[PDB]
Write a protein that binds this ligand. Structure first.
Ligand code: VO4
Length: 297
């Protein structure tokens, strides 16, 4: 059904019209805390801020601001934290957020350098023997192992609360071939990566919300969460036709501004959900088909 809607929009060539409608319908809530003068150096982009009602607050008395939003999909019963690529001065805040929110997975959809510019701090260690200590938030981070595939890398990290000496395993899922304001190479390649995140346990309700980011934490991050929630809703009722992608996106836009930054990303979201529906509706072999088509070795 979503498939036939997809074909209607393609034949009309009205992806831009549909996407601008979403933009005009999208919620508009205040971002007063993000705009305080004292927080200016905590925001990577002047025009990408968390709403006050849904922002993640750090558990510190000094300044609890971080550019991060809690997306709570009530009906699908999944939550995500969407955040910007950490800044040189906010890597401690980032890992403090991960600790306090009890997240098990971090999904990173960007490269540290994209289009010749630095999009994100190097906020996790690249070498086992060179751990990182974030002195402002009293956290230590150690690379434990790395599994490099052709277009994504999975890292096992150990996060230590230096104050309590509690340790935690964090899984890092790094998509390395998704261009800013672009789409993944194929649905199959995107779905293969999403299902790798799912199979790690990182999205399970026994854990805190997965942390999802790219550079701004809205475009690629929005595509990832939208596809996931749509597939989860379909799974819940085994009813692909009860899932209205545009309504799920607007619901997600109540928690964070600008989710999906281009009409082509919206169109890709449809493709990913339409294709992923094959798996959700009983055809477990398409998962293997996606892994082959993705060429991850
Ligand atoms: O770094 V993103 O522009 O896909 O929000």
């Amino acid at each position: 059904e979503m498939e036939k809607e997809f074909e209607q929009i393609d034949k009309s060539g009205s992806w831009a019209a549909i996407y601008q409608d979403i933009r005009h319908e999208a919620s508009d809530f205040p971002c007063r805390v993000a705009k305080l003068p004292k927080n200016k150096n905590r925001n990577r982009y002047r025009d990408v801020s968390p709403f006050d009602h849904s922002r993640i607050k750090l558990h510190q008395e000094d300044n609890d601001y971080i550019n991060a939003s809690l997306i709570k999909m009530e009906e699908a019963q999944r939550s995500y934290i969407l955040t910007q690529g950490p800044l040189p001065n906010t890597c401690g805040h980032f890992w403090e957020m991960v600790w306090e929110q009890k997240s098990r997975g971090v999904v990173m959809l960007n490269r540290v350098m994209e289009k010749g510019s630095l999009k994100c701090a190097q906020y996790w260690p690249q070498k086992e023997e060179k751990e990182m200590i974030f002195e402002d938030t009293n956290l230590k981070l150690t690379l434990i192992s790395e599994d490099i595939k052709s277009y994504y890398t999975v890292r096992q990290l150990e996060l230590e609360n230096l104050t309590t000496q509690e340790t935690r395993e964090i899984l890092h899922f790094h998509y390395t071939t998704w261009p800013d304001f672009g789409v993944a190479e194929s649905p199959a390649s995107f779905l293969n990566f999403l299902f790798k995140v799912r199979e790690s346990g990182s999205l399970s309700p026994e854990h805190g919300p997965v942390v999802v980011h790219c550079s701004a934490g809205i475009g690629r991050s929005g595509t990832f969460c939208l596809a996931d929630t749509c597939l989860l809703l379909m799974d819940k009722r085994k009813d692909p036709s009860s899932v209205d992608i545009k309504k799920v996106l607007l619901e997600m836009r109540k928690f964070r501004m600008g989710l999906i930054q281009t009409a082509d990303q919206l169109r890709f979201s449809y493709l990913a959900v339409i294709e992923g529906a094959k798996f959700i509706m009983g055809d477990s072999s398409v998962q293997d088909q996606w892994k082959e088509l993705s060429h991850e070795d």
